[PDB]
Each structure stands twice: as C-alpha cells, then as structure tokens.
C-alpha cells in the first residue's frame with residue numbers, strides 16, 4: 001500500500017468528464033478540471049491539460065499521467081508550505097500518506113487552515129485529532145472517505161484500506 005494505491009481507491013478512475021460530489025467538472029483519478037459550470041470550459045481545460053483534442057475522453061495512460069503530476073504537486077505544495085512542512089517532517093511514513101491525501105483532495109490552503117488538528121497532529125495526540133477532524137464540512141460531505149483518512153492518521157496503519 002502506498003499513496004498512489006491509496007488515492008486510487010478513494011477517487012476511482014473515470015475516463016470521461018464527470019461531476020464530483022461537489023458538482024465540479026473532473027476527470028481521471030480525481031483530477032479537477034474547473035469549478036465552472038460550463039462543460040465547454042471543462043472541455044477546454046481538458047485539452048490544454050492533455051495536449052490534444054480530446055472531446056471529453058482520455059486514455060488510462062493519459063489519466064495516470066495527470067495523477068502522477070497531481071501527486072507530485074501535492075507533495076511539493078506540502079514541502080513549501082510554512083504550515084505544512086513541519087507537520088509532515090514530524091510524521092511517520094503512513095501518516096504522511098494521509099496528509100498527502102487530504103492535500104490532494106482539498107489543496108494546501110484548505111489543509112493549511114485546519115489549525116487545531118495540525119497542532120494535535122504535531123503533538124502526536126492521535127485520538128483528539130481524530131475527533132477534531134470529524135467536525136468538519138469535509139467529513140460531513142464525504143464521510144466514508146474521511147473516515148478512512150482519519151483512521152489512517154489515528155492508527156498510523158493502512159487498515160482502513162485493507
């Protein structure tokens with residue numbers, strides 16, 4: 001089990017443009033296209049991302065390429081964030097995977113804002129952190145996934161995913 005296998009479970013793989021739970025245009029492995037309501041704005045973004053005229057449809061390879069770029073960017077955004085870097089640096093390899101997951105899903109900024117949980121994470125207070133992450137719009141909108149991520153932080157193991 002690794003971050004790729006982990007995010008692939010959580011986001012799935014879709015080869016045709018679609019809406020996410022939030023209503024946004026997305027494709028592949030959780031790759032957001034646009035927060036805009038126009039399927040055209042979305043086809044536009046897709047082709048620019050892919051580098052070709054897709055007509056809203058990509059190959060698996062193509063989807064995997066975006067994903068690779070997205071995970072890479074998540075890791076880099078963590079390592080560059082003043083709030084994030086230090087949390088990450090303090091954690092074990094499983095728990096790091098969990099941080100990357102949230103970052104992938106919600107952006108540096110989003111996570112960078114969970115002030116209290118970040119501190120508990122840092123203080124290695126596993127249980128309270130888990131309670132705190134749960135009082136969030138994030139958990140309420142996508143509780144199964146959130147539970148998985150939260151368990152991963154709590155336990156420090158891949159159980160939720162096995």
Ligand SMILES: [Cl-]
Nearest residue numbers: 048049066069
């Ligand atoms: Cl892109």
Ligand SMILES: [Cl-]
Nearest residue numbers: 142143144145
């Ligand atoms: Cl869910």
